[PDB]
Design an enzyme around this catalytic site. Structure first.
Site, PDB file in Angstrom:
ATOM      1  N   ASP A 127      -0.232  24.322   2.889  1.00 32.81           N
ATOM      2  CA  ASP A 127       1.140  24.029   3.283  1.00 32.81           C
ATOM      3  C   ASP A 127       1.611  22.704   2.666  1.00 32.81           C
ATOM      4  O   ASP A 127       2.369  21.948   3.278  1.00 32.81           O
ATOM      5  CB  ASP A 127       1.218  23.961   4.812  1.00 32.81           C
ATOM      6  CG  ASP A 127       2.563  24.401   5.365  1.00 32.81           C
ATOM      7  OD1 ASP A 127       3.535  24.536   4.599  1.00 32.81           O
ATOM      8  OD2 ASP A 127       2.647  24.619   6.590  1.00 32.81           O
ATOM      9  N   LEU A 138      12.403  12.127  18.049  1.00 32.34           N
ATOM     10  CA  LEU A 138      12.574  12.184  16.601  1.00 32.34           C
ATOM     11  C   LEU A 138      13.051  13.531  16.066  1.00 32.34           C
ATOM     12  O   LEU A 138      13.768  13.587  15.065  1.00 32.34           O
ATOM     13  CB  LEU A 138      11.272  11.773  15.907  1.00 32.34           C
ATOM     14  CG  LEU A 138      10.714  10.397  16.295  1.00 32.34           C
ATOM     15  CD1 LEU A 138       9.443  10.109  15.504  1.00 32.34           C
ATOM     16  CD2 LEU A 138      11.754   9.316  16.040  1.00 32.34           C
ATOM     17  N   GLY A 139      12.649  14.612  16.727  1.00 32.28           N
ATOM     18  CA  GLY A 139      13.055  15.937  16.288  1.00 32.28           C
ATOM     19  C   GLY A 139      12.734  17.013  17.305  1.00 32.28           C
ATOM     20  O   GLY A 139      11.831  16.846  18.128  1.00 32.28           O
ATOM     21  N   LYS A 184       3.597  15.019  19.311  1.00 33.35           N
ATOM     22  CA  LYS A 184       4.108  16.365  19.059  1.00 33.35           C
ATOM     23  C   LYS A 184       3.896  17.174  20.339  1.00 33.35           C
ATOM     24  O   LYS A 184       2.800  17.176  20.890  1.00 33.35           O
ATOM     25  CB  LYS A 184       3.363  17.018  17.889  1.00 33.35           C
ATOM     26  CG  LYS A 184       3.931  18.370  17.467  1.00 33.35           C
ATOM     27  CD  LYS A 184       3.234  18.920  16.228  1.00 33.35           C
ATOM     28  CE  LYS A 184       3.833  20.258  15.804  1.00 33.35           C
ATOM     29  NZ  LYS A 184       3.217  20.800  14.556  1.00 33.35           N
ATOM     30  N   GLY A 233      12.823  21.571  17.993  1.00 28.54           N
ATOM     31  CA  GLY A 233      13.021  22.923  17.508  1.00 28.54           C
ATOM     32  C   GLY A 233      12.670  23.924  18.590  1.00 28.54           C
ATOM     33  O   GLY A 233      12.636  23.578  19.775  1.00 28.54           O
ATOM     34  N   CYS A 234      12.386  25.158  18.186  1.00 28.36           N
ATOM     35  CA  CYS A 234      12.042  26.217  19.128  1.00 28.36           C
ATOM     36  C   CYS A 234      10.567  26.232  19.538  1.00 28.36           C
ATOM     37  O   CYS A 234      10.208  26.866  20.528  1.00 28.36           O
ATOM     38  CB  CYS A 234      12.446  27.582  18.562  1.00 28.36           C
ATOM     39  SG  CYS A 234      11.713  27.974  16.959  1.00 28.36           S
ATOM     40  N   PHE A 235       9.722  25.531  18.784  1.00 30.04           N
ATOM     41  CA  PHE A 235       8.291  25.470  19.079  1.00 30.04           C
ATOM     42  C   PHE A 235       7.899  24.226  19.873  1.00 30.04           C
ATOM     43  O   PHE A 235       6.808  24.158  20.442  1.00 30.04           O
ATOM     44  CB  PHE A 235       7.482  25.529  17.787  1.00 30.04           C
ATOM     45  CG  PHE A 235       7.545  26.859  17.097  1.00 30.04           C
ATOM     46  CD1 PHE A 235       6.776  27.928  17.550  1.00 30.04           C
ATOM     47  CD2 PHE A 235       8.370  27.047  15.993  1.00 30.04           C
ATOM     48  CE1 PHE A 235       6.827  29.168  16.914  1.00 30.04           C
ATOM     49  CE2 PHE A 235       8.430  28.281  15.348  1.00 30.04           C
ATOM     50  CZ  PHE A 235       7.656  29.345  15.810  1.00 30.04           C
TER      51      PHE A 235
END
Length: 276
Positions: free
Chosen positions: A129, A16-17, A38, A19-21
């Protein structure tokens, strides 16, 4: 850790997605349940820091908050939660479906978010957040509060706040961003900003302004104007959320009730327009 499950019980299907993390995947648990996974990319952050949101979800549970299912504690670290088909509210708002959303649908989503936050409020926590990027959407326009990595009790005698903190001023209440004063009221400020995201189809708040300009203007009394086709009554609500004095801001309990009854009690004469 009673939440721990074997790695082999999970099957990562669709990415789904990324990134760098780490990454976010849609998968299946125990060959029967569709879940969200995740992942943590080794070395980008400590596993302890990565698992913080999982710790919060073990304590915060509600119909309008994304639910934690399981955790795989050995690297590569895995956080398993309930699958939310439409992704982030922000992406949904900006995507092809967003163009068809009108005020009734947007207010309904805001009311659901307010309910989840009303629970956060009752639990004596603060999210820190709250924004469209951190709200997840499922079928039937269901919206739930997500990304609890920064959530914590307002009063914790054993918690020592980190200094030099860098919180996004566009979404953070000035007293929180400047003085580290995080309360449920600072979350209310963020909710007001989220209301602008909803009414602008996901546009970034304070267009054309950089962080330092936002801080200066907000402290000087500047507030975002009423978006096109947005009823003055809804913008009035946003402004209440943005009162300089934190305690003068409304409760999430009030926000939820106000948004749930909006079309009968506040704007009974509402009529669809071009965008809202």
């Amino acid at each position: 850790d009673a939440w721990e499950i074997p790695r082999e019980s999970l099957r990562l299907e669709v990415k789904l997605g990324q990134g760098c993390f780490g990454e976010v995947w849609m998968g299946t648990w125990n060959g029967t349940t569709r879940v969200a996974i995740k992942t943590l990319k080794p070395g980008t952050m400590s596993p302890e820091a990565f698992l913080q949101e999982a710790q919060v979800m073990k304590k915060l549970r509600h119909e309008k908050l994304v639910q934690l299912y399981a955790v795989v504690s050995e690297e590569p670290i895995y956080i398993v939660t309930e699958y939310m088909s439409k992704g982030s509210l922000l992406d949904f708002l900006k995507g092809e479906t967003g163009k068809y959303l009108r005020l009734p649908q947007l207010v309904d989503m805001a009311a659901q978010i307010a309910s989840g936050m009303a629970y956060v409020e009752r639990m004596n926590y603060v999210h820190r957040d709250l924004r469209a990027a951190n709200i997840l959407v499922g079928e039937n326009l269901v919206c739930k509060v997500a990304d609890f990595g920064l959530a914590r009790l307002i009063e914790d005698n054993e918690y020592t706040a980190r200094q030099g903190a860098k919180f996004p001023i566009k979404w953070t209440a000035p007293e929180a961003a400047l003085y580290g004063r995080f309360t449920i009221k600072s979350d209310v400020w963020s909710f007001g900003i989220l209301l602008t995201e909803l009414t602008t189809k996901g546009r970034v708040p304070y267009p054309g302004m950089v962080n330092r300009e936002v801080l200066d203007q907000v402290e000087r009394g500047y507030r975002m104007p009423c978006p096109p086709e947005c009823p003055e009554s809804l913008h009035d609500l946003m402004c209440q959320c943005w009162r300089k004095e934190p305690e003068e801001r409304p409760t999430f309990e009030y926000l939820q009730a106000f948004l749930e009854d909006y079309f009968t009690s506040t704007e009974p004469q509402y009529q669809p327009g071009e965008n809202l």
